[PDB]
Design a protein around this ligand. Structure first.
Ligand SMILES: NC[C@H]1O[C@H](O[C@H]2[C@H](O)[C@@H](O[C@H]3O[C@H](CO)[C@@H](O)[C@H](N)[C@H]3O)[C@H](N)C[C@@H]2N)[C@H](O)[C@@H](O)[C@@H]1O
Ligand SMILES: NC[C@H]1O[C@H](O[C@H]2[C@H](O)[C@@H](O[C@H]3O[C@H](CO)[C@@H](O)[C@H](N)[C@H]3O)[C@H](N)C[C@@H]2N)[C@H](O)[C@@H](O)[C@@H]1O
Lengths: 137, 136
């Protein structure tokens, strides 16, 4: 009802808590911060400019800028103008997907591919609508 | 196969985060709080906890959290322990009103069976997540 909204909130919070911990090392190894890690993953889908990363994130442009030219300085991200990723930035993503899919696999090894398929169809349809509403304001 | 489901879940979450971010700017601006401050009010909307555990859930490191707490204490949004105020209840309510109306108007053409099956699959995955997290 609005039980689903609370569940989702709690589900997303839980996924972030797990992700943080599993990614603590890789991040330390890269000089990277959590939020920077995110930008690097947020940027895993499309090249973005500071404002877009700020809008799609809620935080004050100031903070988003500090962590953005730290990634350029680290050659983890790059200009063109927009912001794409660099090999060291990619290698990070690979190492990230790897830690993620190894545990994701675990807790889902006894799942039924068909049931998961339909579930996703629904989520993809809600994702589509979420993005759509987000375009206006 | 799963590498894909991971990307989507992640995109799905990125989009949910984006969306709540836009739908709540005006409101946080209104109650004069930052987004991080908002999130802090939402965990305490559920239950109240001290600083020690408040950062353990988050992930944002050293004292950064206690700084949000005292920031929120100053607006009379959070009472000391540290829980939630009467002023805080209003925000969440207003927050929930927005989140729900939109979430409903976005799920309203689906078949109850359909949604439930989604919940049941996300619940089980959340059950394994925590259980894995717990095993520190
Ligand atoms: N605080 C808010 C302000 O931050 C930055 O100002 C400066 C940062 O503070 C510096 O980073 C410092 O603080 C970081 C943690 O935040 C540390 O990791 C780092 N070692 C420190 O050198 C960075 N090198 C230059 C940057 N111009 C942003 O530009 C500005 O938009 C924002 O308003
Ligand atoms: N409880 C489950 C919910 O968790 C967040 O709810 C809160 C957000 O997290 C806040 O986000 C900002 O404040 C966080 C504080 O820690 C920062 O970490 C984060 N990087 C910031 O952008 C936002 N401003 C308010 C929102 N009520 C998610 O957004 C939401 O999708 C999910 O349903």
């Amino acid at each position: 009802i609005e039980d689903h909204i609370s569940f989702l909130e709690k589900f997303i919070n839980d996924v972030n808590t797990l992700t943080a911990k599993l990614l603590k090392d890789l991040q330390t190894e890269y000089g990277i911060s959590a939020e920077q890690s995110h930008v690097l993953n947020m940027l895993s889908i499309e090249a973005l400019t500071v404002g877009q990363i700020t809008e799609k994130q809620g935080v004050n442009k100031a903070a988003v800028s500090r962590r953005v030219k730290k990634l350029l300085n680290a050659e983890l991200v790059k200009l063109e103008k927009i912001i794409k990723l660099s090999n060291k930035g990619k290698k990070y993503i690979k190492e990230r997907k790897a830690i993620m899919s190894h545990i994701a696999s675990d807790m889902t090894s006894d799942f039924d591919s068909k049931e998961i398929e339909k579930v996703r169809q629904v989520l993809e349809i809600i994702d589509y609508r979420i993005q759509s509403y987000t375009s206006k304001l």
